[PDB]
């Protein structure tokens, strides 16, 4: 078995390899039916979840400067917007996510650590969240002086 296994690896290391992982989603041959218990078992014994576990260590989330700018134009202060849109994204991100190990700036993309784009969507929520406090405080001083 060891000898046949080496001979196979030699044949496959003379080539460039392409990868398809096939998954059975249910046990009873049912058209377009997913069983979560079957699917999770299939993914673990296929290396998929472990490969994904490795990928999340580095910088898996990759956005272009155009995509980042479109969703996050609201998070900017109006005067931190520049004629260059790539440089604008550089300035904004380094005042929204403070730790600078959390992302790297390429030629045409931004490379983000795991959970970081989720944090950007959280501070997009938190900004609307913190906007209210500002209005509410003004109303509650107005109404108290009237009282």
């Amino acid at each position: 078995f060891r000898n046949s296994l080496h001979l196979l690896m030699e044949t496959l290391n003379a080539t460039t390899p392409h990868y398809v992982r096939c998954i059975k989603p249910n046990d009873f041959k049912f058209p377009f039916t997913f069983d979560e218990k079957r699917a999770v078992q299939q993914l673990r014994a296929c290396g998929v979840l472990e490969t994904i576990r490795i990928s999340a260590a580095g910088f898996p989330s990759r956005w272009t400067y155009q995509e980042f700018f479109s969703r996050y134009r609201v998070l900017m202060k109006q005067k931190d917007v520049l004629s260059d849109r790539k440089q604008t994204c550089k300035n904004v991100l380094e005042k929204l996510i403070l730790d600078k190990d959390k992302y790297q700036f390429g030629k045409t993309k931004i490379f983000f650590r795991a959970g970081q784009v989720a944090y950007l969507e959280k501070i997009r929520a938190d900004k609307l969240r913190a906007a209210c406090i500002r209005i509410q405080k003004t109303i509650r001083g107005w109404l108290m002086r009237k009282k």
Binding site: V74, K127, L128, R129, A130, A131, C132, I133, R134, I135, Q136, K137, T138, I139, R140, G141, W142, M144, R145, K146
Partner: protein
């Protein structure tokens, strides 16, 4: 903005001290519009840890220490959103209630229901938020 007369309208008892929990209303009876957060931070940065009440001297020292932050809470005269991106000038009553009661330092629904009394609502279900902000503050 200290005022002994205003303190004396909140010292009811004539004891000389007011409850520590009436600190946010005394600041907002003087003038100042502070957050409930800023008010808690101001109390927490003094070892008024076990203090049940505050005298006028204590309240004076806190306002002097925090004068800059508290004064910034009567500069504003206008108020933008960040709701509305279309720039319609309108916001749904649903979004307006959500920003008031879900977000930040959360008003009660009963306070929001008070603020939307008399406030016009169209057939889309939207309110002019510029008129609504002017009607709450100007009044």
């Amino acid at each position: 903005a200290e005022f002994k007369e205003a303190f004396s309208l909140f010292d009811k008892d004539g004891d000389g001290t007011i409850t520590t929990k009436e600190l946010g209303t005394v600041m907002r009876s003087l003038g100042q519009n502070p957050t409930e957060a800023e008010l808690q931070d101001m109390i927490n940065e003094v070892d008024a840890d076990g203090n049940g009440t505050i005298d006028f001297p204590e309240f004076l020292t806190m306002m002097a220490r925090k004068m800059k932050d508290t004064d910034s809470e009567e500069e504003i005269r206008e108020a933008f959103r960040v709701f509305d991106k279309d720039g319609n000038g309108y916001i749904s009553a649903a979004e307006l209630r959500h920003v008031m009661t879900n977000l930040g330092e959360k008003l009660t629904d009963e306070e929001v229901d008070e603020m939307i009394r008399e406030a016009d609502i169209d057939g889309d279900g939207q309110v002019n938020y510029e008129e609504f902000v002017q009607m709450m503050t100007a009044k």
